[PDB]
Amino acid sequence: KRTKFRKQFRGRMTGDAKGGDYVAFGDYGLIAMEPAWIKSNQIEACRIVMSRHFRRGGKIYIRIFPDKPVTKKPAETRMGKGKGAVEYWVSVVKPGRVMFEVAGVTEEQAKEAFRLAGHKLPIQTKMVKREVYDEA
Amino acid sequence: PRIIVKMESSAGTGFYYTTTKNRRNTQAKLELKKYDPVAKKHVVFREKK
Amino acid sequence: NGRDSNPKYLGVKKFGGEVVKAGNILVRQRGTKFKAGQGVGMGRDHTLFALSDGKVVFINKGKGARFISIEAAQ
RNA sequence: GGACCGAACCGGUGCCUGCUGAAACAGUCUCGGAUGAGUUGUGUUUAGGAGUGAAAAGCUAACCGAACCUGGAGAUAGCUAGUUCUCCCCGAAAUGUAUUGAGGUACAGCCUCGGAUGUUGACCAUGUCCUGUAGAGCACUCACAAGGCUAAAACCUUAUGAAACUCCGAAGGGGCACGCGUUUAGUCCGGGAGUGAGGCUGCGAGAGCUAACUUCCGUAGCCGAGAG
RNA sequence: UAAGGUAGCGAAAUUCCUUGUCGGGUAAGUUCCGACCUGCACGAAAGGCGUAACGAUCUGGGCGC
RNA sequence: GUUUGACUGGGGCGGUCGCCUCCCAAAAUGUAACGGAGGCGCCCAAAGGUCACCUCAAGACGGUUGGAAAUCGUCUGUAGAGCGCAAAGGUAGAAGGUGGCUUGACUGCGAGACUGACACGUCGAGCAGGGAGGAAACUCGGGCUUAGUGAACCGGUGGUACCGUGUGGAAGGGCCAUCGAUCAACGGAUAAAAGUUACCCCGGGGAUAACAGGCUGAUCUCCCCCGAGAGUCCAUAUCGGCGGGGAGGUUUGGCACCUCGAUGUCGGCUCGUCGCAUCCUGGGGCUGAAGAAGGUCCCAAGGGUUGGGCUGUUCGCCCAUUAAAGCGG
RNA sequence: ACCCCCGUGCCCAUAGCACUGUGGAACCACCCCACCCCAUGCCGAACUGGGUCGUGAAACACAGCAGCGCCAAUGAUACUCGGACCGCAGGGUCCCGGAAAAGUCGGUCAGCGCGGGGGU
Numbered sequence A: 001k002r003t004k005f006r007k008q009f010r011g012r013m014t015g016d017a018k019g020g021d022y023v024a025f026g027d028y029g030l031i032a033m034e035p036a037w038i039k040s041n042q043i044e045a046c047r048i049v050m051s052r053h054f055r056r057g058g059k060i061y062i063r064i065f066p067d068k069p070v071t072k073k074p075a076e077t078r079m080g081k082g083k084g085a086v087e088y089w090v091s092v093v094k095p096g097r098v099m100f101e102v103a104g105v106t107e108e109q110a111k112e113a114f115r116l117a118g119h120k121l122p123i124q125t126k127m128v129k130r131e132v133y134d135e136a
Numbered sequence B: 001p002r003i004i005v006k007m008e009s010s011a012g013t014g015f016y017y018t019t020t021k022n023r024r025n026t027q028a029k030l031e032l033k034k035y036d037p038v039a040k041k042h043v044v045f046r047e048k049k
Numbered sequence C: 001n002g003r004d005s006n007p008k009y010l011g012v013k014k015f016g017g018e019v020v021k022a023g024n025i026l027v028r029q030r031g032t033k034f035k036a037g038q039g040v041g042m043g044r045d046h047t048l049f050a051l052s053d054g055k056v057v058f059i060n061k062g063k064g065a066r067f068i069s070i071e072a073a074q
Numbered sequence D: 001g002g003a004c005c006g007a008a009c010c011g012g013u014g015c016c017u018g019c020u021g022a023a024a025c026a027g028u029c030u031c032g033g034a035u036g037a038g039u040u041g042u043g044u045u046u047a048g049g050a051g052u053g054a055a056a057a058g059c060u061a062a063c064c065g066a067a068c069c070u071g072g073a074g075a076u077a078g079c080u081a082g083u084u085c086u087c088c089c090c091g092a093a094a095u096g097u098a099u100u101g102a103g104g105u106a107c108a109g110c111c112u113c114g115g116a117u118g119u120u121g122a123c124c125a126u127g128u129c130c131u132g133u134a135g136a137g138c139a140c141u142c143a144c145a146a147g148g149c150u151a152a153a154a155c156c157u158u159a160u161g162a163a164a165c166u167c168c169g170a171a172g173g174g175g176c177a178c179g180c181g182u183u184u185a186g187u188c189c190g191g192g193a194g195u196g197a198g199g200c201u202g203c204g205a206g207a208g209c210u211a212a213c214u215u216c217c218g219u220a221g222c223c224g225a226g227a228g
Numbered sequence E: 001u002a003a004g005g006u007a008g009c010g011a012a013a014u015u016c017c018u019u020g021u022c023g024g025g026u027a028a029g030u031u032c033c034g035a036c037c038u039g040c041a042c043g044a045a046a047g048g049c050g051u052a053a054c055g056a057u058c059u060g061g062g063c064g065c
Numbered sequence F: 001g002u003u004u005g006a007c008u009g010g011g012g013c014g015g016u017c018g019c020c021u022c023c024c025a026a027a028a029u030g031u032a033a034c035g036g037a038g039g040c041g042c043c044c045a046a047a048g049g050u051c052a053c054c055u056c057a058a059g060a061c062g063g064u065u066g067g068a069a070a071u072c073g074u075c076u077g078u079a080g081a082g083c084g085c086a087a088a089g090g091u092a093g094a095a096g097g098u099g100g101c102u103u104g105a106c107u108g109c110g111a112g113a114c115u116g117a118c119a120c121g122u123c124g125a126g127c128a129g130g131g132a133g134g135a136a137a138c139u140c141g142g143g144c145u146u147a148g149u150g151a152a153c154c155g156g157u158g159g160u161a162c163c164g165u166g167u168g169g170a171a172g173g174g175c176c177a178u179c180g181a182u183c184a185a186c187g188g189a190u191a192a193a194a195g196u197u198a199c200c201c202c203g204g205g206g207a208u209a210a211c212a213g214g215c216u217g218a219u220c221u222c223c224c225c226c227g228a229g230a231g232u233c234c235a236u237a238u239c240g241g242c243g244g245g246g247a248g249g250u251u252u253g254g255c256a257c258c259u260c261g262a263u264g265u266c267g268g269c270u271c272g273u274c275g276c277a278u279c280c281u282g283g284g285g286c287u288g289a290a291g292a293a294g295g296u297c298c299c300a301a302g303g304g305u306u307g308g309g310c311u312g313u314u315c316g317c318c319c320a321u322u323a324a325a326g327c328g329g
Numbered sequence G: 001a002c003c004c005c006c007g008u009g010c011c012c013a014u015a016g017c018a019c020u021g022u023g024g025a026a027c028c029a030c031c032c033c034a035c036c037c038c039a040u041g042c043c044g045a046a047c048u049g050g051g052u053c054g055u056g057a058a059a060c061a062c063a064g065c066a067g068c069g070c071c072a073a074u075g076a077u078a079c080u081c082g083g084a085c086c087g088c089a090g091g092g093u094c095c096c097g098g099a100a101a102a103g104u105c106g107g108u109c110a111g112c113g114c115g116g117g118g119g120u
């Protein structure tokens, strides 16, 4: 969720992601296919769904993180003073980027958990078990 | 109030002045420099004014 | 909280393999991205200018330390 | 009797009608006063920043926050309109900086004409130099995911984000020379300008909801002034 | 701050929240009457509070038609 | 008699107006926004000239006051420091820290260049007069640079001996220094200036607001996906957290496109007509549907959809009915 | 001519660090002494002035070595001038040249002058 950090506001455009195409932690991983912002409560709902389905057990990693501030001008004004101070934090997400990955849960239950979590994300997404991997 | 005033320096028996802002903080005692005036070579200009 | 900014043109002005007349300005820079070479002089703002007419030429070694210099004609 | 009802008379309450009227303020109906601070005739006096006014800025000869007439006077009009006979050649601007400036104007920029030089212009190639964007990466700053060690900080494995981070870093872009090669402009001097409200789309960003036939910059092209 | 409302009146030609809350009137009352006071931002000759009579005054009811 | 700025996603209120630094800025320079951050209107007779010397932050182990950080000692240690103020470049063969002597924080000049429409602004070899430090080569015409600012006019002061009205003087003026500017709206209208108009007038504008239409759909209205739980029991009879996706264009809005040489605006009345996301009636599925009375979803727009009190009201509350007392164009 | 030392440059990390070995009476170095030239904001530690011996202890010089730094390919990809497209949009594709960063293969503990001293 919200970071405790630095400059309030930013900008925006896109290109395919590089910083995490492969599933390092855990066994399985759901993975993004579209370039939307993800932001805060969207993730946290993914987290709370999977933690319901799995917890008492399993290991849940959230490799994505609401870095990027996004702004809302007030109410109903004209293009006025500056931008709007707050609103929500997002994480940009490009295809092949891994958002989620379970540990210690059978293949089928990871299927169902990824299905639930992905039914509330702006992007469609595909899951995979980790092929052979390199990058260490 | 004011702190570092502008100080004009009469040359030692010359005819010309020089003018600069000697800060009145640490520079409590009147300026005595040397400079080339109307006539000879560098001489003592007494920045009293 | 926004209105402010300011506009001071800077950069290399006389590039390598150019024939500077002496007293020409060859680079304006804020620090020492270029260090004045053989045949070059540097003023208060670290401007590099020709000391004598010649071919401007650049020596590059490691971007801590490169130098502009003049190789006179004749 | 600044009493009552009520004609004349003075008035003008509400509705309708009239609205290129019968009338530039009226008509029918209804209504107020009606011996009083009353109504009315003749003569006469007060006027323009002036008169009058039981006071609305009312009235002062049918439209008074300062009458009419003549004159200054063709006031001034950074504003709106309009600006007429023909064919021929070239041909823009809606940018920059400044402005009690922002739909105005000065200078520059871009147009045209005459003179001078007389290939210095254009494109594309080679040589050379400059640059920190795209990407990428965590070596610094900030942020940040799972473990280890541990008085948590640092520090180890694994793992990320970046307009205001950068160990790195292109494609392109700019200057210079040369023409090794094709083309045809260029520069200087002097007369006349207009333009300084731009518009769309693709690409690159900001503001905005990664809204707008949206807004402000950059860049290419068309409209502008281009019919087919 | 120089002081901080004496009588009187108060949801008012003043009240924003508002159709305040209670009651009266009505089958039903955002209006109107009466009470209360919490007076957004009443009040004593820019007068306060009353007042018979008057009014082509404005507001709410009733009878008659 | 006049004054009573401008910007301005209409104007007003608020904010801003000059200067420096970074991002925006698309690897040349330049580049707008009421884009995103931050500073200046100074300071220093030494923080300057020069000449000599020294080298930082931080950590670990060890030690009197101490007890995480003070002071001292060893080790590691391109800088993780420092540089008067902001940030950026630069910087250890120092521009950093310390001492010596000192004023070049000079006069007269200025080859040649950066930068600007102009006027300004920047750098600068080298020449003379005369100095300062060094033994010397040599360095010095303020500061590590980049902000610390103001044309002209009019005047104060000190030199100079150009002008000076018949002549010689003097008054007055000129030339060289130099004092006076939040003239900050910071290229600066006068030496000198605030409000109000619903009594208002003129010239203009759809270059620009209010209505409506348009574009958009944040807000509004409506429908869909998932399914956590509720429903004793069962997620889906009904309901549906946290989240996701769409439609409509009836709300408040954004934007400013036609209309400012006029497109009359709320409500009522009158007259209609259309959509359907259906209030009633008509047909269906499912039900936590026995019957009856219902719930909810699907089909369906033929027709129908009351009279009053209050209020300008639209709404909404109420009275008394109703098959129903539909929502919008 | 061969060897090594003392200086000193070009090049300044493929030339630097760490572990290790070898050098002393040539050379350098520590070392001895210091009232004074000279000097430490206290200390001859450093500057400094007079010299053996001793010792190569530390330093420095040279040699080994690839633990660490530093260099760093090929293949491919990112991105992209140019050309032509798709998607309502975020965003994506194709042909043509250009072509990284990182990482893998590997490469290195330099290379090149001038002088003077002393050896053989």
Ligand SMILES: CC[C@H]1OC(=O)/C=C/[C@H](C)[C@@H](O[C@@H]2O[C@H](C)C[C@H](N(C)C)[C@H]2O)[C@@H](C)C[C@@H](C)C(=O)/C=C/[C@H]2O[C@@H]2[C@]1(O)CO[C@@H]1O[C@H](C)[C@@H](O)[C@@H](OC)[C@H]1OC
Pocket (backbone or CB within 6 Å): D019, D024, D025, F262, F264
């Ligand atoms: C009907 C009576 C009079 O009109 C009006 O009051 C008004 C008429 C319009 C509606 C109005 O328009 C509107 O303006 C608005 C500002 C805007 C609006 N837009 C949205 C369209 C527009 O609609 C006006 C300004 C239009 C304009 C031509 C005008 O000035 C007309 C003036 C006079 O002729 C008319 C009269 O008819 C004359 O009646 C007089 O009445 C007296 C009592 C009589 O004694 C008699 O006088 C002797 C008689 O004759 C004079």
Ligand SMILES: [Mg+2]
Pocket (backbone or CB within 6 Å): A014, A015, A016
């Ligand atoms: Mg992309």
Ligand SMILES: [Mg+2]
Pocket (backbone or CB within 6 Å): none
């Ligand atoms: Mg791409």
Ligand SMILES: [Mg+2]
Pocket (backbone or CB within 6 Å): A018, A019, A020
């Ligand atoms: Mg990676």
Ligand SMILES: [Mg+2]
Pocket (backbone or CB within 6 Å): none
């Ligand atoms: Mg009477």
Ligand SMILES: [Mg+2]
Pocket (backbone or CB within 6 Å): none
């Ligand atoms: Mg009358």
Ligand SMILES: [Mg+2]
Pocket (backbone or CB within 6 Å): none
């Ligand atoms: Mg009459």
Ligand SMILES: [Mg+2]
Pocket (backbone or CB within 6 Å): none
């Ligand atoms: Mg009567």
Ligand SMILES: [Mg+2]
Pocket (backbone or CB within 6 Å): none
């Ligand atoms: Mg009477």
Ligand SMILES: [Mg+2]
Pocket (backbone or CB within 6 Å): D049
């Ligand atoms: Mg008067």
Ligand SMILES: [Mg+2]
Pocket (backbone or CB within 6 Å): none
């Ligand atoms: Mg009249």
Ligand SMILES: [Mg+2]
Pocket (backbone or CB within 6 Å): none
């Ligand atoms: Mg007449």
Ligand SMILES: [Mg+2]
Pocket (backbone or CB within 6 Å): none
């Ligand atoms: Mg008049």
Ligand SMILES: [Mg+2]
Pocket (backbone or CB within 6 Å): none
């Ligand atoms: Mg006229």
Ligand SMILES: [Mg+2]
Pocket (backbone or CB within 6 Å): D075
């Ligand atoms: Mg005249």
Ligand SMILES: [Mg+2]
Pocket (backbone or CB within 6 Å): D076
């Ligand atoms: Mg006038």
